[PDB]
Every structure is written in structure tokens, then in C-alpha cells.
Amino acid sequence: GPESQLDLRVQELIKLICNVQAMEEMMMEMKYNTKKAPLGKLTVAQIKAGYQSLKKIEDCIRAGQHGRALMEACNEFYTRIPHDFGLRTPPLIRTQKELSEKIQLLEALGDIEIAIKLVKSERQGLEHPLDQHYRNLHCALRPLDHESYEFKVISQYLQSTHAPTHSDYTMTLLDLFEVEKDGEKEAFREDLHNRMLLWHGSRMSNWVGILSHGLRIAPPEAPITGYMFGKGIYFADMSSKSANYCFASRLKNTGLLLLSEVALGQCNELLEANPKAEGLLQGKHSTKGLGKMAPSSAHFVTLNGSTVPLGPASDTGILNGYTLNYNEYIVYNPNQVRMRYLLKVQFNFLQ
Numbered sequence: 505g506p507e508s509q510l511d512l513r514v515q516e517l518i519k520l521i522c523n524v525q526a527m528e529e530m531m532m533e534m535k536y537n538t539k540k541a542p543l544g545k546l547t548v549a550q551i552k553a554g555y556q557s558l559k560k561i562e563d564c565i566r567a568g569q570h571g572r573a574l575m576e577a578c579n580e581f582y583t584r585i586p587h588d589f590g591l592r593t594p595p596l597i598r599t600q601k602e603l604s605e606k607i608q609l610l611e612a613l614g615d616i617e618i619a620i621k622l623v624k625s626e627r628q629g630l631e632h633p634l635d636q637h638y639r640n641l642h643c644a645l646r647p648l649d650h651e652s653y654e655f656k657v658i659s660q661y662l663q664s665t666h667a668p669t670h671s672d673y674t675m676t677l678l679d680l681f682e683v684e685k686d687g688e689k690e691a692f693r694e695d696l697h698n699r700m701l702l703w704h705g706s707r708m709s710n711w712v713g714i715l716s717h718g719l720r721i722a723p724p725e726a727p728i729t730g731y732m733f734g735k736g737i738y739f740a741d742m743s744s745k746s747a748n749y750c751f752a753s754r755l756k757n758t759g760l761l762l763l764s765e766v767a768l769g770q771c772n773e774l775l776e777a778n779p780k781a782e783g784l785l786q787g788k789h790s791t792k793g794l795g796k797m798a799p800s801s802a803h804f805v806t807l808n809g810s811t812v813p814l815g816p817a818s819d820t821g822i823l824n825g826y827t828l829n830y831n832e833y834i835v836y837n838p839n840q841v842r843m844r845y846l847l848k849v850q851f852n853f854l855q
């Protein structure tokens with residue numbers, strides 16, 4: 505029986521992100537019907553059909569259709585993406601937050617299809633499965649020293665930018681990995697100014713796909729009204745805002761946080777949401793949803809050519825009527841993103 509040749513730290517990481525049984529438990533909590541559509545029978549085409557159904561719902565909403573048209577549009581979606589609501593009728597989809605909820609379900613399902621394809625790509629016996637899964641990611645994950653300057657700034661970044669409204673939990677940095685996805689260095693825009701180290705969170709089910717395919721842009725079939733600032737890659741400067749998207753629980757209190765170098769260039773700053781913000785760029789390179797509270801430049805430091813927006817965060821007075829509490833950074837080409845650090849985090853829930 506071939507033993508693992510990977511670092512014990514990387515071994516634990518792959519086990520976490522390749523746990524298909526944990527993936528089935530997560531999708532059921534999202535009301536997805538795994539009995540009716542098993543995860544091992546997921547296909548790219550089925551997920552794309554779900555996106556197009558949501559786009560059809562957005563067409564009903566734009567046309568003011570809240571009757572049979574909307575019900576039949578939602579029925580088609582729930583038939584392609586089956587849910588488990590008991591004996592109840594499936595809820596209708598209408599609002600942006602309800603659209604986004606389904607978009608996030610589809611994004612998890614898409615990355616889950618990548619994960620099953622990967623674990624099924626194991627040639628059993630050849631070597632330990634963990635080493636096989638790791639190589640098939642085609643993404644380097646190098647564990648770093650806890651007395652390294654990297655670990656010091658990133659631990660500071662994690663604690664200093666924890667938002668006061670997200671007071672239901674704290675976060676303990678368990679481990680830190682340097683990330684090198686094949687090709688990101690060669691496509692990155694080292695020319696663009698305002699290179700910043702920004703957070704991004706996601707459910708545990710999505711990290712095989714993220715580390716295998718990079719942060720991606722929403723597909724053309726998706727309705728644009730589900731993305732507050734358009735079909736781009738979203739980042740935060742407040743760790744807890746991204747860490748909320750890990751969707752950790754008291755029993756599943758381990759999550760992953762990604763730090764990436766983002767070439768924002770000149771930002772197009774918006775006071776409120778607009779799903780069509782990409783057309784408002786006008787030679788600018790990124791959209792910045794202005795938040796009321798943000799880190800101040802008086803605490804910033806540099807870590808390997810990028811600016812770390814360390815806390816403590818102060819208020820900006822932004823009060824345009826739901827304004828953003830905290831910032832949001834959106835780039836619309838993946839060549840502005842380079843994944844760099846992966847954080848294994850313990851969530852400390854405060855009851």
C-alpha cells in the first residue's frame with residue numbers, strides 16, 4: 505500500500521477538499537435533492553440548463569410576469585435542479601437575493617462536478633490517492649513557516665479586518681499555504697497599478713475547482729441580475745465578509761480563505777449596486793463598491809509587491825437606501841488575479 509509522499513499539512517488539506525461525503529451533506533443543507541439528482545451524475549450541461557432557467561425567470565421578472573409564466577419558469581428550473589422541500593410546493597424565485605442563492609447553488613454544483621471528475625481520475629494502486637488528487641489539481645500548495653513574515657502579516661490581516669457586524673464568531677489561522685496555479689504568473693497584469701492582496705471565501709465543496717480552474721467569471725447563460733456588480737470576480741478587504749461565504753458551522757468549523765493579488769488599476773467607485781457596472785468602466789479597470797467602513801491607508805504594508813490593507817478599519821462616512829457596510833472589488837478579466845495564499849481557518853463560534 506503506497507504511503508503518502510506529501511507534507512502532512514497538505515495531506516490534511518486534500519482530505520478536506522476531496523471529501524465527497526461532506527459535499528453531499530452540504531448540498532442537502534442547501535435543499536438540493538441528491539436522491540433525485542446524485543452528485544456523481546452531475547453534468548456541465550445540466551448546470552448550464554439551470555442557469556438558463558434562472559435567466560428565463562429574470563425575463564419574467566423584467567416583464568412583470570408574476571403569474572403562470574413565473575411559476576412555469578421556476579418549475580422548469582426546479583425540474584433541472586431538483587430540490588427537497590418536503591411535501592411543500594417549491595418557493596418561487598423573484599428577488600435578487602433569491603436569484604443569488606440559486607446562482608451560489610449552481611456555482612457549488614459546478615465545482616463539485618470538477619471534484620468528482622478529479623477523485624474519479626485516480627488510478628488506484630499507483631500511489632496514495634491524496635498525492636494523485638494533488639497532482640491532478642495542477643496547483644502548487646507550499647506550506648509556510650508560522651514565524652515567516654508572510655504568516656505574521658496574514659495573521660494580522662485576518663484579525664485586524666474582522667468586521668464588527670460579523671460578531672457571531674472569531675477566526676484562528678490554523679495553517680498557511682503558498683499557492684501557484686499554472687499559468688497565473690504568465691497571464692497576470694504586472695503593469696496595472698494598485699495591486700492589492702484581497703480575500704475571497706467559498707464553501708468547502710468548491711476548493712478543488714477553485715484551485716484547479718482558478719476563480720472564474722460567471723457563464724454567459726447566467727442572468728446578470730444575480731451579480732450586484734456584474735459578471736466579474738469579487739474580492740473583499742475585510743476578512744469576515746469573505747469568510748461568511750465559507751458558510752462554516754459549529755460542527756464544521758474548519759474553512760478555507762484565499763488571498764489573491766488583484767490588479768485593480770484605476771477603480772470605478774460606485775455607491776450602490778448595479779449589475780451592469782462593467783459597461784460603466786470607461787477605460788477604468790475595476791469596480792469598487794464603496795463601503796461605509798474600510799481599512800485606512802495608515803496601516804497598510806507591502807508583502808511581495810502587493811499592498812496588504814491591514815486593519816483596524818475606520819468609517820468612511822459613505823451614506824448614499826441600503827448602502828454597503830464594507831467594500832467590494834470586482835475585476836472582469838482573470839488576468840488581473842493571481843492566487844497566492846490559502847488559509848486554513850478555525851471558526852470560533854460565540855453562541
Ligand SMILES: C[C@]12CCCN1CC1=NNC(=O)c3cc(F)cc4[nH]c2c1c34
Nearest residue numbers: 703704705706738739740745746749832
Ligand atoms: C455573492 C457573490 C457574488 C459573486 C460570487 N458570489 C460568491 C462570493 N464568494 N466570496 C467572496 O469572498 C466575496 C467577497 C465579496 F467582497 C463580495 C462577494 N460577492 C460574492 C462573493 C463575494
